[PDB]
């Protein structure tokens with residue numbers, strides 16, 4: 001069994017796949033803390049988890065001339081000033097299950113918890129590349145490609161890329177992270193080194209990093225080429241053409257209700273509605289609207305968070321709103337978020353439906369009853 | 373009459389205000405050309421148009437130490453390398469009239485044409501500020517404030533600001549423009565000098581520029597403070613608090629149908645649907661979906677445009693789709709656009725309603741009949 005060496009996990013996780021391991025925290029714990037504890041942080045693995053001996057580990061970085069820089073874990077820790085970045089990772093397939101209700105889709109059936117937040121610590125990717133000898137700026141459209149130590153039966157490693165400009169930008173905060181919430185990277189989260197790409201879909205934050213290569217082209221890996229792309233609702237498997245859509249990098253504005261849960265019976269008087277909101281590209285959440293009547297009338301929620309510099313809001317906003325609720329009524333609780341570019345979420349999931357269940361950001365709706 | 377000196381305009385414009393002058397091109401000409409001719413480019417004036425004598429004109433630029441740099445038009449032309457940028461300007465109030473159909477709103481009742489595109493030419497704002505002596509980077513959150521030569525009865529000039537980082541960024545393409553579509557700036561469009569801020573709401577592109585000042589604060593002008601801000605649909609004039617919402621800078625993804633027009637009767641056989649799509653922040657339009665049945669089923673439109681570098685898609689995409697249409701049927705033609713961060717447009721206008729009629733980006737719907 002290729003998975004026998006996989007690490008043990010917290011028992012309260014909502015697992016949608018055991019082998020490879022894919023799981024989200026319970027929604028009732030998801031937004032309980034601003035920083036998601038390491039044991040609860042959602043896990044998305046395509047493959048078996050690498051078993052890495054710390055001392056013999058080497059990160060490979062190709063130089064401008066095609067030579068190779070080889071970095072140990074100790075060197076990565078000591079040569080580069082540690083930078084700490086609080087960033088939310090959200091999977092492209094977050095809230096996929098909601099799309100399946102329109103029409104069955106391909107992919108892991110995530111509920112609202114394919115998203116978590118951590119304080120990451122590591123070397124700036126910028127500094128590692130400048131140390132390798134690369135300039136601040138390359139002419140034309142270049143990419144930094146990453147390969148993981150995890151590989152399929154045939155030997156093809158997990159791979160993804162980001163634009164070179166994001167990799168080199170001080171403000172973009174791209175890390176080669178060896179620390180997560182103040183402790184070393186857990187195995188499930190990329191021990192000993194992962195890329196963290198703030199404001200960008202989880203897919204690009206390559207775990208168990210073995211190689212960094214600068215290329216005039218995007219990662220040729222099938223996960224970069226044939227996955228994590230958004231198509232029109234008319235597109236089906238007979239007509240899909242991966243060349244017609246860009247690889248997801250930045251994600252659009254997103255929010256979900258974490259409290260209460262669908263189908264719950266709540267006591268009369270007062271109810272505290274809670275959830276999360278986030279947007280990609282370092283765009284801050286500037287408002288969250290909350291409705292109890294299916295989106296007919298709205299109230300403005302209270303936002304909790306780090307006030308980050310403009311364009312660098314990498315972490316989610318947690319939100320809450322206390323409302324009066326009357327015994328014997330039915331409520332449909334809805335939330336929608338607005339970001340710093342005033343992007344908004346769409347009303348319904350059908351018009352954003354797609355065959356791969358990606359980019360599920362229509363308003364989250366939670367129907368509950370108020371008991372007598 | 374304070375407006376007696378205003379310039380004459382093209383007679384086919386859809387004027388919503390004569391004094392001050394505010395008008396959009398007819399929708400049937402709006403997307404006819406990629407570059408909107410100067411005579412048709414939508415015009416938004418708060419005040420009378422300044423009469424500027426070219427030779428005595430001086431642009432005032434405050435230095436880091438509080439001194440003043442004074443630049444003539446000839447100096448602006450000769451001292452700084454001319455840069456050309458093709459950029460779409462869209463007013464915050466574009467498509468405001470559609471919001472009024474939910475509930476009356478305050479503001480000029482724009483239809484879909486408070487948007488136009490031009491090739492702008494001028495000095496980079498970056499170069500002008502570096503020449504004034506400013507560094508590449510100031511610590512903290514700084515702003516570049518602009519004042520126009522147009523002033524209200526009391527003497528308060530039109531004013532707006534942008535973040536300092538955008539002003540200094542080579543990639544952001546902020547111009548002090550003295551040329552528009554290859555000719556000098558028309559009076560209605562800011563003669564002799566306007567700011568053009570690509571990817572950002574029209575409000576910040578200050579016309580008839582008299583002063584550029586670097587400040588630790590946003591523009592204190594009432595147009596920056598008490599206007600062009602997006603609020604929750606629950607907010608009314610008794611409860612509005614301008615401190616609770618950010619000044620609009622980047623705009624969200626937008627699209628409209630320009631052909632055919634609402635209420636038209638079209639011949640059977642084939643119909644070519646056309647329109648525009650655009651998104652702020654240099655985010656490219658990556659797809660436009662078009663429906664004929666009120667948004668139940670969709671087809672992918674053809675996109676026409678400049679393929680710009682990533683993050684620098686300042687110009688709109690024009691789009692078209694040819695479909696079969698059957699005699700004696702009714703169609704509701706709908707378009708929605710998707711940008712490079714996969715932001716999308718929302719289904720309906722009610723949930724994005726606001727008291728000032730801002731940020732109207734719900735799907736544009738055009739009902740027509742197919743004749744026999």
Ligand SMILES: Nc1nc2c(c(=O)[nH]1)N[C@H]1C(S)=C(S)[C@@H](COP(=O)(O)O)O[C@H]1N2
Pocket residue numbers: 041042043044045046047089090091092147148149150158188189190201202203204205206207208209
């Ligand atoms: N090497 C490697 N890196 C990877 C993956 C993987 O399978 N292998 N999964 C990616 C995807 S699709 C997501 S959503 C995130 C999930 O990160 P987490 O498990 O730390 O939440 O890791 C990304 N990095």
Ligand SMILES: Nc1nc2c(c(=O)[nH]1)N[C@H]1C(S)=C(S)[C@@H](COP(=O)(O)O)O[C@H]1N2
Pocket residue numbers: 413414415416417418419461462463464519520521522530560561562573574575576577578579580581
């Ligand atoms: N000086 C000055 N600049 C200004 C304005 C103004 O009234 N005065 N209007 C602003 C607004 S709200 C918009 S939408 C754009 C419109 O530019 P246009 O008239 O060239 O289309 O100009 C901006 N710049």
Ligand SMILES: [Mo]
Pocket residue numbers: 044090091092093202203
């Ligand atoms: Mo993912």
Ligand SMILES: [Mo]
Pocket residue numbers: 416462463464465574575
């Ligand atoms: Mo405007």
